[PDB]
Scaffold this active site. Structure first.
Site, PDB file in Angstrom:
ATOM      1  N   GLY B  97      46.668  96.918 -54.339  1.00  0.00           N
ATOM      2  CA  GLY B  97      47.583  96.109 -53.654  1.00  0.00           C
ATOM      3  C   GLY B  97      47.888  97.254 -52.563  1.00  0.00           C
ATOM      4  N   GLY B  99      46.181  98.496 -49.957  1.00  0.00           N
ATOM      5  CA  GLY B  99      45.669  98.274 -48.644  1.00  0.00           C
ATOM      6  C   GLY B  99      44.617  99.128 -48.386  1.00  0.00           C
ATOM      7  CE  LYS B 100      41.942 100.775 -53.521  1.00  0.00           C
ATOM      8  NZ  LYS B 100      43.256 100.044 -53.905  1.00  0.00           N
ATOM      9  CB  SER B 101      40.038  95.866 -49.270  1.00  0.00           C
ATOM     10  OG  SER B 101      39.475  96.257 -50.544  1.00  0.00           O
ATOM     11  CE1 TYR B 102      45.855  94.258 -42.481  1.00  0.00           C
ATOM     12  CE2 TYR B 102      46.270  96.806 -42.194  1.00  0.00           C
ATOM     13  CZ  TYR B 102      46.470  95.507 -42.097  1.00  0.00           C
ATOM     14  OH  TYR B 102      47.187  95.312 -40.903  1.00  0.00           O
ATOM     15  CG  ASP B 250      37.394  99.278 -49.869  1.00  0.00           C
ATOM     16  OD1 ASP B 250      38.504  99.818 -50.562  1.00  0.00           O
ATOM     17  OD2 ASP B 250      37.332  98.071 -49.684  1.00  0.00           O
ATOM     18  N   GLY B 253      41.054  99.442 -57.266  1.00  0.00           N
ATOM     19  CA  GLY B 253      42.103 100.153 -57.933  1.00  0.00           C
ATOM     20  C   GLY B 253      42.499 100.531 -59.584  1.00  0.00           C
TER      21      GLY B 253
HETATM   22  N1  LIG Z   1      50.122  97.757 -43.050  1.00  0.00           N
HETATM   23  C1  LIG Z   1      50.038  96.466 -43.794  1.00  0.00           C
HETATM   24  N2  LIG Z   1      50.830  95.259 -43.217  1.00  0.00           N
HETATM   25  C2  LIG Z   1      50.971  94.244 -43.750  1.00  0.00           C
HETATM   26  N3  LIG Z   1      50.495  93.962 -44.704  1.00  0.00           N
HETATM   27  C3  LIG Z   1      49.330  94.837 -45.219  1.00  0.00           C
HETATM   28  C4  LIG Z   1      49.285  96.082 -44.918  1.00  0.00           C
HETATM   29  N4  LIG Z   1      48.479  96.868 -45.422  1.00  0.00           N
HETATM   30  C5  LIG Z   1      48.111  96.228 -46.633  1.00  0.00           C
HETATM   31  N5  LIG Z   1      48.659  94.856 -46.491  1.00  0.00           N
HETATM   32  C6  LIG Z   1      48.434  93.510 -47.316  1.00  0.00           C
HETATM   33  O1  LIG Z   1      47.841  94.305 -48.496  1.00  0.00           O
HETATM   34  C7  LIG Z   1      47.151  93.115 -49.082  1.00  0.00           C
HETATM   35  C8  LIG Z   1      45.820  93.411 -49.812  1.00  0.00           C
HETATM   36  O2  LIG Z   1      45.276  94.537 -49.200  1.00  0.00           O
HETATM   37  P1  LIG Z   1      44.144  95.115 -49.905  1.00  0.00           P
HETATM   38  O3  LIG Z   1      43.304  95.538 -48.675  1.00  0.00           O
HETATM   39  O4  LIG Z   1      43.399  94.259 -50.851  1.00  0.00           O
HETATM   40  O5  LIG Z   1      44.384  96.615 -50.817  1.00  0.00           O
HETATM   41  P2  LIG Z   1      43.300  97.139 -51.968  1.00  0.00           P
HETATM   42  O6  LIG Z   1      43.416  98.263 -51.997  1.00  0.00           O
HETATM   43  O7  LIG Z   1      41.899  96.697 -51.392  1.00  0.00           O
HETATM   44  N6  LIG Z   1      43.640  95.932 -53.247  1.00  0.00           N
HETATM   45  P3  LIG Z   1      42.075  96.330 -54.226  1.00  0.00           P
HETATM   46  O8  LIG Z   1      41.174  95.255 -53.846  1.00  0.00           O
HETATM   47  O9  LIG Z   1      42.471  96.153 -55.630  1.00  0.00           O
HETATM   48  O10 LIG Z   1      41.801  97.703 -53.721  1.00  0.00           O
HETATM   49  C9  LIG Z   1      46.679  92.110 -47.862  1.00  0.00           C
HETATM   50  O11 LIG Z   1      47.063  90.481 -48.266  1.00  0.00           O
HETATM   51  C10 LIG Z   1      47.596  92.573 -46.778  1.00  0.00           C
HETATM   52  O12 LIG Z   1      48.203  91.599 -46.152  1.00  0.00           O
HETATM   53 MG   LIG Z   2      40.322  96.544 -52.307  1.00  0.00          MG
END
Ligand SMILES: Nc1ncnc2c1ncn2[C@@H]1O[C@H](COP(=O)(O)OP(=O)(O)NP(=O)(O)O)[C@@H](O)[C@H]1O
Ligand SMILES: [Mg+2]
Ligand SMILES: CC(=O)O[C@H]1C(=O)[C@@]2(C)[C@H]([C@H](OC(=O)c3ccccc3)[C@]3(O)C[C@H](OC(=O)[C@H](O)[C@@H](NC(=O)c4ccccc4)c4ccccc4)C(C)=C1C3(C)C)[C@]1(OC(C)=O)CO[C@@H]1C[C@@H]2O
Ligand SMILES: Nc1nc2c(ncn2[C@@H]2O[C@H](COP(=O)(O)OP(=O)(O)OP(=O)(O)O)[C@@H](O)[C@H]2O)c(=O)[nH]1
Ligand SMILES: Nc1nc2c(ncn2[C@@H]2O[C@H](COP(=O)(O)OP(=O)(O)O)[C@@H](O)[C@H]2O)c(=O)[nH]1
Ligand SMILES: [Mg+2]
Lengths: 429, 367, 440
Positions: B97, B99-102, B250, B253
């Site tokens: 959570g 925000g790496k997949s974002y 990517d 976690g």
């Molecule tokens: N800058 C941001 N502003 C708002 N929401 C954000 C932001 N960065 C991340 N998020 C939120 O982060 C949530 C999940 O992020 P995600 O990209 O899955 O992180 P992650 O590292 O990929 N989790 P994981 O799959 O275990 O690696 C999304 O539903 C976004 O809404």
């Molecule tokens: Mg991810």
């Protein structure tokens, strides 16, 4: 509830395994027909580890014999203890490997391995709670190496959360017995490093030196060498079968012994060993066993610890003992010979004591050691390997069976990279 | 070539519904560009320095680092080096959570580094699409799941057991690679988008306690960019050739098995992810100690991720990483571990060179 | 069960076949009328081991062998002799003339009209085998049938069978001794054709056995009934692993690997160390160390070729009887400490071991003693080029004037098939040179 499946591959493993069952049976009191003629009750309390039960209070071993030459499988059936095995567990074929790893891995072993594994699933799924596997094979040949490491690679994918405690004879330094030992050993280590959890390295040159120097035997046969390895295969798994003050299964050893997942190649031993006369001039006690076990002449690996460092070792004792005698002596070794031990591991020793000795000995002890010396079993092969590969010495016997030069090169770098992981801890810090 | 260091960046994501519901205190603060951490114990306040810091926590404050900003601060220089002929690597790091997949891929309304990089690359190439240099692009998109490799750009057959696994193999010169990877040719950004959409539809995702859509498989997006330059030579032309590789990663976690309560397959893949990340941390520490003149071995071979990214973490590539962290108190330990690995990644250097690919033909010798 | 087919070609092979089967029948317990009373008194068994003897219902055991020739006058000593009631009457012997020391006559002219009948009776014996290990061909360079027909047959078998080991036991032409003025021509054309098909062709020289019989056995007037029992012991020491129990058993496919580095250098030499008369059978210890060093003694090589003028690429040792492995490793260590035995740098191992428990027997009426241990050493040496060159020089001298060529052309053969063959013989001599050179 802690069971072991025993696979045998090739001529070396099967002539060992036949001697292995001729040792365990004499411990648990089973005779060459599977019947029980023992004295104590502990022999049957945990007979379920290696042996299964049968109709008339008989006991059948969890033994799966593999080969590609029927000549040796018949030698086992005609022996003294060949009658207790399950005939549906004598899996074999024809067109032997020819001391070619490719034949045992790709061409002839591929057409037989599915018949081997279907037997394993029967023996395994009949277990209440499986601990791990156990293989006895010889590097340097084709059957034990190709058809052996193949089963390992197939079994991990099918049973990944269990132990594959492989017993493996490595090539010798001085006198070969197969000219292309190096080609086959480099490829097997490429597989063992990634698909095993504890691998006991044995060299026949050191077994001869044990028998000729200590035991004072003049005419030792292979039936005598394997009388030593069986003794080590049995000490690793005693605190499952019999009780004790401080017990240790296979998994307990792998944790305390393998700090990084690739360094699971061990140097075993056994104590006490003497001549048929000298036992009147010794006295058995924890100190006299500890001295033999940490003596370079007692190791089965043909590789001197004193050119390296002990990362972590194990001592599985058997007999009525003081734990002070055990805990104190393993300490005295560390503080006296500290330079042959690691600084960044506070205690480099574990212990395990069973209360039920061997058939005719007041006490016994097994040694297991992880040492940076074990490079020397790998630099030899690599230097032997590159001298042969650099000019393609015996290579068309391996390419023409479905291989490429790329695979020989991978196996070299993985062997060379395993060497460096041992080297970086060899030196002081 | 010459020594070049790994560009480390950090991003603080904003509170989520979970940290808001179980109301937690803000602990991460940016002292201009430093990133500070005020522990609830209040024994001390840690302070970490980075080449770049991004504060996407607020949506108002001066310092708001949006997706286009992260691109134009990190990814565009890697595009410059790729056009210069260097290999480039970018990889994300952080806990669940964060925000790496974002940051990398983004949503359909806020695209990430991958789409921005691909579009910008193709546009710059079209701008520079003169008769001198002919350009070619190939791509691959693979993943790692329970230590097995899978191809994302290969549509599954008519079954459920369709994740046909590949294997890694070491070419003695080019290094590790994946056997059986369906490399596909790239004309333009629209085809890139289509392939990427198919890939992310095939990728392993799942819901859990700390994320509704979390990635349970590491993902590598590889581009191979070939520039065949024309030149006036007395014989056959078009020998000057520059092949550069861009690798965008990517990762998954940490995930403690208590918050993200799971059982079965979720737990198994959670264990494999954890082991891969442990090996990655060991590699990073070993390269950092290499940068200080000691003698160290790098455990690349202990995992498939590090094995296939061997030439990027060290080796020969302009490397960068993006750490992702949350601002709450409940993730303080993982935040600190991530920040420590980030700051000791900064001391890593790697020898990147231009991939002329003329060794022993004429031109590398003439050089 | 594992099985081997024994093909015998020409006068030089047949007379060795009579010597080999005289020995095989003795070891297992077979009388010449095919019977084995041992199973009649015991109640059955595999003592008539199926590798070499097939069994019928009346207790008769027939050998898995075929005895080809073009002369009747050789086989008809068998059809009328002691072993007439053992061999299948299909012996495949041509009611026509011989080849008259001519490759062209044995290869094509009077090699056809026969070959199809020979290749069928081989097919019949193979369809009766549940897993075939390989062939064992017995011929002699120098003749038409041992050169031609053996080069015709090994070509057909590489087609139909292909993957089975095809081994040769060949009488190399000697440098000084010879029974024909056209041995070299028939020998150099043979290696041009078998070199692509056979996998390991063990070579023996009749001159060395003549000397071995003088120094050791003290036989000043030997015959061919003395050389061939000593050749029969080489074959038995090879094929013992398939017949008897042992500790390390070397099958056929393992000779083919350890001893053949590259496909074209499969020309090793054989020997047998305890060639000891009955009188000298006493006064000797006959240990592994005494027997093993003698296998490297040049005097006891069965080919007139000083190994000290070359280097060993591979060496296979086949021990027999009361032999303990520790005594062997001590020996092989003692040999690698010497300096008259110079190995290649690309074979630091160099050696292979085989050990059986069935000691050798004593063929009655003979000369060899009852020894409890025995060794057969099979060596791949670079020295054998000196014999190839000696034969090539004989070839270039008498070919320049096209002597004895019209007898070959008159049977169907082009002049260029000599020259082509000569080029083949001039290559191989460079390959044995290159591989023996030390690497950088
Ligand atoms: N800058 C941001 N502003 C708002 N929401 C954000 C932001 N960065 C991340 N998020 C939120 O982060 C949530 C999940 O992020 P995600 O990209 O899955 O992180 P992650 O590292 O990929 N989790 P994981 O799959 O275990 O690696 C999304 O539903 C976004 O809404
Ligand atoms: Mg991810
Ligand atoms: C009472 C007595 O003095 O006889 C001993 C004996 O003197 C010595 C020499 C035995 C003897 O050693 C050997 O003969 C031997 C030969 C070749 C290779 C290895 C050993 C003994 O044969 C070996 C044999 O060992 C055992 O009985 C153990 O139970 C052993 N199992 C077997 O030997 C065995 C093998 C096949 C069939 C039946 C039993 C064992 C080892 C490990 C784990 C469990 C059991 C024993 C006690 C002895 C003799 C018989 C002299 C010793 O052997 C071992 C391995 O324990 C040598 O040192 C020990 C104990 C004694 O010193
Ligand atoms: N060792 C050995 N060699 C023999 C024997 N009989 C013949 N030779 C060899 O045979 C060679 C001569 O060629 P042959 O073998 O007679 O030719 P062939 O294969 O019989 O073909 P033909 O002569 O046409 O019948 C010589 O080198 C002889 O030494 C024998 O009994 N033992
Ligand atoms: N210790 C021991 N080693 C053996 C025995 N038999 C064979 N070997 C070893 O096995 C190696 C050869 O491999 P091999 O067993 O022939 O492989 P395989 O032919 O494929 O089954 C040699 O190094 C021998 O030392 C035995 O009875 N005891
Ligand atoms: Mg004749």
């Amino acid at each position: 509830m802690r069971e072991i499946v025993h696979i045998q591959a090739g001529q070396c493993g099967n002539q060992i395994g036949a001697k292995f069952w001729e040792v365990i049976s004499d411990e648990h009191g089973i005779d060459p027909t599977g019947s029980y003629h023992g004295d104590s009750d502990l022999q049957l309390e945990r007979i379920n580890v290696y042996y299964n039960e049968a109709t008339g209070n008989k006991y059948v071993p969890r033994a799966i014999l593999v080969d590609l030459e029927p000549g040796t499988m018949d030698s086992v059936r005609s022996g003294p203890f060949g009658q207790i095995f399950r005939p549906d567990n004598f899996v074999f074929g024809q067109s032997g490997a020819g001391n070619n790893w490719a034949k045992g891995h790709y061409t002839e072993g591929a057409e037989l391995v599915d018949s081997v594994l279907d037997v394993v699933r029967k023996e395994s799924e009949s277990c209440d709670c499986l601990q791990g596997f156990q293989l006895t094979h010889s590097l340097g040949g084709g059957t034990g190496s190709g058809m052996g490491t193949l089963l390992i690679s197939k079994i991990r994918e099918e049973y990944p959360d269990r132990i594959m405690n492989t017993f493996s004879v490595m090539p010798s330094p001085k006198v070969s017995d197969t000219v292309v030992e190096p080609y086959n050993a480099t490829l097997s280590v490429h597989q063992l490093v990634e698909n095993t959890d504890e691998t006991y390295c044995i060299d026949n040159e050191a077994l001869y030196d044990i028998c000729f120097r200590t035991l004072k035997l003049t005419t030792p046969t292979y039936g005598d060498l394997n009388h030593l390895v069986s003794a080590t295969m049995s000490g690793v798994t005693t605190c499952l079968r019999f009780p004790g003050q401080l017990n240790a299964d296979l998994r307990k050893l792998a944790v305390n012994m393998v700090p990084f997942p690739r360094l699971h190649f061990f140097m075993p031993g056994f104590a006490p060993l003497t001549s048929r006369g000298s036992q009147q001039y010794r006295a058995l006690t924890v100190p006299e066993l500890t001295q033999q076990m940490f003596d370079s002449k007692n190791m089965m690996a043909a590789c001197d610890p004193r050119h390296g460092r002990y990362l972590t070792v194990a001592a599985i004792f058997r007999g009525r003992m003081s734990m002070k005698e055990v805990d104190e002596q393993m300490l005295n070794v560390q503080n006296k010979n500290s330079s042959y031990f690691v600084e960044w591991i506070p205690n480099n020793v574990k212990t395990a004591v069973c209360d039920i000795p061997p058939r005719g000995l007041k006490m016994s002890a097994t040694f297991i050691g992880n040492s940076t010396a074990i490079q020397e079993l790998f630099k030899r092969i690599s230097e032997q390997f590159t001298a042969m590969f650099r000019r393609k010495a015996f290579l068309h016997w391996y390419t023409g069976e479905g291989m490429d030069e790329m695979e020989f090169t991978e196996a070299e770098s993985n062997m060379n990279d395993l060497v460096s992981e041992y080297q970086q801890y060899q030196d002081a810090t | 070539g010459s020594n070049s260091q790994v560009t480390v960046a950090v991003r603080v994501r904003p509170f989520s519904k979970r940290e808001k519901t179980e109301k937690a205190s803000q602990v991460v603060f940016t002292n201009g560009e430093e990133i500070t951490v005020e522990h609830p114990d209040m024994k001390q306040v840690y302070s970490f320095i980075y080449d770049v810091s991004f504060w996407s926590f607020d949506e108002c404050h001066p310092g708001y680092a949006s997706q286009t900003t992260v691109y134009e601060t990190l990814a565009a220089p890697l595009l410059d080096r790729a056009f210069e002929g260097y290999n480039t690597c970018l990889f994300a790091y952080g806990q669940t959570g964060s925000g790496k997949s974002y940051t990398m891929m983004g949503l359909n309304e806020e695209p990430g580094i991958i789409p921005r990089f691909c579009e910008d690359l193709f546009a710059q190439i079209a701008k520079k699409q003169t008769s001198e240099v002919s350009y070619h692009l190939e791509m691959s998109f693979f993943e790692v799941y329970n230590e097995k490799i899978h191809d994302l750009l290969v549509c599954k057959g008519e079954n459920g057991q369709r994740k046909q696994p590949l294997r890694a193999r070491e070419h003695p010169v080019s290094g590790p690679y994946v056997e059986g990877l369906s490399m596909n040719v790239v004309s333009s950004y629209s085809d890139i988008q289509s392939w990427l959409e198919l890939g992310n539809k095939q990728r392993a995702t799942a819901a859990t306690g700390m994320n509704d859509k979390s990635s349970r498989s590491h993902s590598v997006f590889t581009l191979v960019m070939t520039q065949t330059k024309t030149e006036v030579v007395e014989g056959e032309e078009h020998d000057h050739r520059i092949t550069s590789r861009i690798n965008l990663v990517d990762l998954a976690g940490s995930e403690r098995c208590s918050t993200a309560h799971s059982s079965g397959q979720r737990l198994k893949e959670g264990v494999s992810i954890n082991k891969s990340l442990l090996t990655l941390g060991k590699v990073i520490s070993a390269l950092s100690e290499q940068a200080n003149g000691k003698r160290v071995f790098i455990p690349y071979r202990e995992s498939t991720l590090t094995w296939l990214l061997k030439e990027s973490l060290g080796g020969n590539s302009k490397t960068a990483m993006i750490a992702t962290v949350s601002p709450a108190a409940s993730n303080i330990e993982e935040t600190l571990s991530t920040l420590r690995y980030a700051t000791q990644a900064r001391l890593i250097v790697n020898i990147a060179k231009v991939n002329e690919d003329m060794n022993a033909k004429l031109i590398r010798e003439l050089k | 069960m594992r099985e081997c087919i024994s093909i015998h070609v020409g006068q030089a092979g047949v007379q060795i076949g009579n010597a080999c089967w005289e020995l095989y029948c003795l070891e297992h317990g077979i009388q010449p009328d095919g019977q084995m009373p041992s199973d009649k008194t015991i109640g059955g068994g595999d003592d008539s081991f199926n590798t070499f003897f097939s069994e019928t219902g009346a207790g008769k055991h027939v050998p898995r062998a075929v005895f080809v020739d073009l002369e009747p006058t050789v086989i008809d000593e068998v059809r009328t002799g002691t072993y007439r009631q053992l061999f299948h009457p299909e012996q495949l012997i041509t009611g026509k003339e011989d080849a008259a020391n001519n490759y062209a006559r044995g290869h094509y002219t009077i090699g056809k009209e026969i070959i199809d009948l020979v290749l069928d009776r081989i097919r019949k014996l193979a369809d009766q085998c549940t897993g075939l290990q390989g062939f064992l061909v017995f011929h002699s360079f120098g003749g038409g049938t041992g050169s031609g027909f053996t080069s015709l047959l090994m070509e057909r078998l590489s087609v139909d069978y292909g993957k089975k080991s095809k081994l040769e036991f060949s009488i190399y032409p000697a440098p000084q001794v010879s029974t024909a003025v056209v041995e070299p021509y028939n020998s150099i054309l043979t290696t041009h054709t078998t070199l692509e098909h056979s996998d390991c062709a063990f070579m023996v020289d009749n001159e060395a056995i003549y000397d071995i019989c003088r120094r050791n056995l003290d036989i000043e007037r030997p015959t061919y009934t003395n050389l061939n029992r000593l050749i029969s012991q080489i074959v038995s020491s090879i094929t013992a692993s398939l017949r008897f129990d042992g500790a390390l058993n070397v099958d056929l496919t393992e000779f083919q690997t350890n001893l053949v580095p590259y496909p074209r250098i499969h020309f090793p030499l054989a020997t047998y160390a305890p060639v000891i008369s009955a009188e000298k059978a006493y006064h000797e210890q006959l240990s592994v160390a005494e027997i093993t060093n003698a296998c490297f003694e040049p005097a006891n090589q069965m080919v007139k070729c000083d190994p000290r003028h070359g280097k060993y690429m591979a060496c296979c040792l086949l021990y027999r009887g009361d032999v303990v492995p520790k005594d062997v490793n001590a020996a092989i260590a003692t040999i690698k400490t010497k300096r008259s035995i110079q190995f290649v740098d690309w074979c630091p191992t160099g050696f292979k071991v085989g050990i059986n428990y069935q000691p050798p027997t004593v063929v009655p009426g003979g000369d060899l003693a009852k020894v409890q241990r025995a060794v057969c050493m099979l060596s791949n040496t670079t020295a054998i080029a000196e014999a190839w060159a000696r034969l090539d020089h004989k070839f270039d001298l008498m070919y320049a004037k096209r002597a004895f060529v019209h007898w070959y052309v008159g049977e169907g053969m082009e002049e260029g098939e000599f020259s082509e063959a000569r080029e083949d013989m001039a290559a191989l001599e460079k390959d044995y040179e290159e591989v023996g050179v030390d690497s950088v």
